Design a protein around this nucleic acid. Structure first.
Ligand SMILES: [Mg+2]
Ligand SMILES: [Mg+2]
Ligand SMILES: [Mg+2]
Ligand SMILES: [Mg+2]
Ligand SMILES: [Mg+2]
Ligand SMILES: [Mg+2]
Ligand SMILES: [Mg+2]
Ligand SMILES: [Mg+2]
Ligand SMILES: [Mg+2]
Ligand SMILES: [Mg+2]
Ligand SMILES: [Mg+2]
Ligand SMILES: [Mg+2]
Ligand SMILES: [Mg+2]
Ligand SMILES: [Mg+2]
Ligand SMILES: [Mg+2]
Ligand SMILES: [Mg+2]
Ligand SMILES: [Mg+2]
Ligand SMILES: [Mg+2]
Ligand SMILES: [Mg+2]
Ligand SMILES: [Mg+2]
Ligand SMILES: [Mg+2]
Ligand SMILES: [Mg+2]
Ligand SMILES: [Mg+2]
Ligand SMILES: [Mg+2]
Ligand SMILES: [Mg+2]
Ligand SMILES: [Mg+2]
Ligand SMILES: [Mg+2]
Ligand SMILES: [Mg+2]
Ligand SMILES: [Mg+2]
Ligand SMILES: [Mg+2]
Ligand SMILES: [Mg+2]
Ligand SMILES: [Mg+2]
Ligand SMILES: [Mg+2]
Ligand SMILES: [Mg+2]
Ligand SMILES: [Mg+2]
Ligand SMILES: [Mg+2]
Ligand SMILES: [Mg+2]
Ligand SMILES: [Mg+2]
Ligand SMILES: [Mg+2]
Ligand SMILES: [Mg+2]
Ligand SMILES: [Mg+2]
Ligand SMILES: [Mg+2]
Ligand SMILES: [Mg+2]
Ligand SMILES: [Mg+2]
Ligand SMILES: [Mg+2]
Ligand SMILES: [Mg+2]
Ligand SMILES: [Mg+2]
Ligand SMILES: [Mg+2]
Ligand SMILES: [Mg+2]
Ligand SMILES: [Mg+2]
Ligand SMILES: [Mg+2]
Ligand SMILES: [Mg+2]
Ligand SMILES: [Mg+2]
Ligand SMILES: [Mg+2]
Ligand SMILES: [Mg+2]
Ligand SMILES: [Mg+2]
Ligand SMILES: [Mg+2]
Ligand SMILES: [Mg+2]
Lengths: 101, 52, 112, 137, 116
RNA sequence: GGUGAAAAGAACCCCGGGAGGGGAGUGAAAUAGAGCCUGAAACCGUGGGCUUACAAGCAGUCACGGCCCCGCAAGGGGUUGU
RNA sequence: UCGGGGCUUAAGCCCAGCGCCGAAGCUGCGGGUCUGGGGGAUGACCCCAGGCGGUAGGGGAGCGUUCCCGAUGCCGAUGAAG
């Protein structure tokens, strides 16, 4: 059931329950959260308005956690200037449960 | 020291490369009538002798 | 099983002997003996001599059979160099490198 | 993650050339040459359709072009700038005129050349009667 | 109290030279690596911003190549949606063109009618 | 400048003219074997994995794919085709 | 050789229009740091708004090396430094 859902500024399709990783959220460790945001479905849930009206995808916040430490580093030539800076983004482990439109 | 002079240290890669055809080639030998010994073609040989 | 043999401190240039060794690498013992015999190079004599002892060790210390061994692997290594002066025109003095080698040869039982 | 394509059978095509304006034709030929028309597009892999053209000599061209248009062949030697007008091309090998137009509109890279192979051109018609031949306009 | 250079410098070096492993020639065997890493760092940070524009266009082509098959400009298509008031098709997920064509098709029809 | 706690400094056999090795033997340890503690880097070499003979390059970076490698998978490592 | 291909009721020039592409700008979601305001009697921590290209320079806060007190201590062959 290809149901889209925008969360964390970005939106993605959602299968009938599956492991997914999304932007950080203010949910309990292993609780449940509903994303009223939903677009389309398995049988052509045309999204009239920007977002489908009565409908919702729910998922269990499997857990939080930071990720790979990407390394940003600036440098300008002929001019003593260099900046080493590490940065690792946070992300919640949204395990999809219910996909009821 | 004079006019012609290497402009850059030749990389180890480009170096080894030039030494491509540098490799040796094994001698050519054949069994003799006398001993089973290996003689180079068109030759006599010690510890074997010859005829005519 | 394998039988080593090493010639340390051989007054001869590595690049030079590498050529000879490269000839015999992974060859039947009797095959090699012949190559070194008629191969035209100074490096032969040294490699042959160490190759030859490599066999003796294979036999008199490792129960191996002469009629069944080969060159599992072999290689020369660069040892210390003898630096020497060299009078050059107009006073310039150049240091010449009489290099040295560490010939290694290792034999092995063929198959079964 | 965006779709990751897999091996696909080469879709051949048969194209006419009578009355077709040189360039306007070359554009489409190019666009079809790379799989840039099919929505399963991927620059990386290169999987454009095998375009085959016929009736090259038939190609139209506006204004003073048969007489004006000049082609440059530079050899490594001095004064080797040898230049040939359009009329002469159609006299000798006319297929060239369409080739040197398509080739120019393909990308510059290694696969761009791999694409120039997908393009077959003759004037007759009568291609090598292989198999596919889905005509088009 | 004299303070030798000691270990300090050697660690700082191999520390960097480890990062620089996998490069070409001296470039991965010395202080050349540093220069190389400088360039790399700046490349990544720029190719990070690029990676966005990369897929922006990657998708666009796909979408356009798809609705052009139904018979319209990508420009025409999008205008219909912007009018229809459907932010839904984020250009990324317009990849429906390959997954569930039919859904894309009905999205097309929506834009057709949405226009006029 | 520096073997080791001690010279216990390697008898005897084997290859070799010798040098040097291979066994044996001492030692906790012998890649502690004698300009011998530790033993880094440049630099030379042997074996293995990925790779390269239509290709244009400050040598990297971003992406996808292929091959090999750790894990059951999800993942990660190495390599580089476009 | 107009960047090239190539373009002629144009892929050129003028006039009117709609749409789309397009930057590290602006928005969205997440995270730093600092400054300001609040909760909080409070220290504390949380929330809200804003600032954060940079050479010569000025300012602030750290990290590591050697050595001394802490040592008649503590770790250390079940392995110190490197
Ligand atoms: Mg509800
Ligand atoms: Mg980790
Ligand atoms: Mg610069
Ligand atoms: Mg040079
Ligand atoms: Mg090499
Ligand atoms: Mg080599
Ligand atoms: Mg004769
Ligand atoms: Mg006789
Ligand atoms: Mg060499
Ligand atoms: Mg013997
Ligand atoms: Mg002289
Ligand atoms: Mg010199
Ligand atoms: Mg006809
Ligand atoms: Mg001229
Ligand atoms: Mg002239
Ligand atoms: Mg054909
Ligand atoms: Mg046919
Ligand atoms: Mg110093
Ligand atoms: Mg975009
Ligand atoms: Mg001692
Ligand atoms: Mg002594
Ligand atoms: Mg003593
Ligand atoms: Mg000795
Ligand atoms: Mg022993
Ligand atoms: Mg021992
Ligand atoms: Mg020993
Ligand atoms: Mg070692
Ligand atoms: Mg030791
Ligand atoms: Mg020894
Ligand atoms: Mg000695
Ligand atoms: Mg000691
Ligand atoms: Mg060296
Ligand atoms: Mg050398
Ligand atoms: Mg190349
Ligand atoms: Mg298991
Ligand atoms: Mg992981
Ligand atoms: Mg132009
Ligand atoms: Mg211009
Ligand atoms: Mg105007
Ligand atoms: Mg007006
Ligand atoms: Mg206007
Ligand atoms: Mg206008
Ligand atoms: Mg309008
Ligand atoms: Mg409008
Ligand atoms: Mg308007
Ligand atoms: Mg407009
Ligand atoms: Mg900004
Ligand atoms: Mg405050
Ligand atoms: Mg409180
Ligand atoms: Mg107080
Ligand atoms: Mg802020
Ligand atoms: Mg001191
Ligand atoms: Mg003291
Ligand atoms: Mg002990
Ligand atoms: Mg230990
Ligand atoms: Mg230990
Ligand atoms: Mg110390
Ligand atoms: Mg310390």
């Amino acid at each position: 059931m290809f149901a889209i859902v925008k969360t964390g500024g970005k939106q993605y399709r959602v299968e009938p329950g599956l492991k997914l990783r999304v932007e950080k959220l203010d949910a309990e460790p292993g609780a449940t959260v509903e994303l009223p945001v939903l677009l389309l479905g398995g049988e052509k849930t045309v999204v009239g308005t920007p977002v489908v009206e009565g409908a919702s995808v729910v998922a269990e916040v499997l857990g939080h956690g930071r990720g790979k430490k990407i390394l940003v580093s600036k440098f300008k030539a002929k001019v003593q200037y260099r900046r080493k800076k590490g940065h690792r983004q946070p992300y919640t482990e949204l395990l999809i449960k219910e996909i009821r439109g | 020291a004079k006019h012609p002079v290497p402009k850059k240290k030749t990389s180890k890669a480009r170096r080894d490369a030039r030494r491509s055809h540098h490799a040796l080639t094994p001698p050519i030998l054949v069994p003799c009538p006398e001993c089973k010994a290996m003689k180079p073609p068109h030759t006599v040989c010690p510890e074997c002798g010859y005829y005519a | 099983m394998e039988a080593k043999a090493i010639a340390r401190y051989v007054r001869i240039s590595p690049r030079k002997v590498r050529l000879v060794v490269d000839l015999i690498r992974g060859k039947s013992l009797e095959e090699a003996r012949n190559i070194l015999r008629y191969t035209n190079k100074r490096g032969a004599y040294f490699v042959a001599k160490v190759l030859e002892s490599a066999a003796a060790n294979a036999v008199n210390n490792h129960d191996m059979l002469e009629d069944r061994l080969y060159v599992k692997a072999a290689y020369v290594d660069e040892g210390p160099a003898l630096k020497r002066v060299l009078p050059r025109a107009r006073g310039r003095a150049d240091i010449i490198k009489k290099r040295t080698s560490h010939i290694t040869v290792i034999l092995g039982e063929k198959h079964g | 993650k965006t779709y990751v394509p897999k091996q696909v059978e080469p879709r051949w095509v048969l194209i006419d050339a009578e009355g077709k304006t040189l360039g306007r034709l070359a554009t489409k030929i190019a666009t079809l040459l790379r799989g840039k028309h099919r929505p399963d597009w991927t620059p990386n892999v290169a999987m454009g359709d095998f375009v085959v053209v016929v009736n090259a000599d038939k190609i139209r061209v506006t204004g003073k072009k048969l007489e004006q248009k000049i082609y440059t062949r530079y050899s490594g030697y001095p004064g080797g700038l040898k230049k040939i007008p359009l009329e002469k091309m159609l006299a000798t090998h006319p297929e060239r005129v369409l080739e040197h137009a398509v080739k120019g509109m393909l990308p510059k890279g290694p696969l761009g050349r791999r694409l120039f192979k997908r393009l077959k051109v003759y004037a007759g018609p009568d291609h090598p009667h292989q198999a596919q031949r889905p005509e088009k306009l | 109290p004299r303070a030798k250079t000691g270990v300090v410098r050697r660690r700082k070096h191999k520390k960097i030279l480890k990062l620089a492993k996998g490069y070409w020639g001296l470039r991965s065997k010395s202080r050349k690596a540093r220069e190389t890493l400088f360039a790399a760092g700046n490349y990544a940070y720029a190719h990070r911003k690029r990676r966005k524009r990369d897929f922006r266009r990657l998708w666009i082509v796909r979408i356009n190549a798809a609705c052009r098959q139904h018979g319209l400009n990508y420009s025409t298509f999008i205008h219909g949606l912007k009018k229809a008031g459907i932010e839904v098709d984020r250009k990324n997920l317009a990849d429906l063109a390959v997954r569930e064509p039919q859904v894309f098709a009905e999205l097309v029809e929506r834009a057709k009618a949405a226009q006029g």
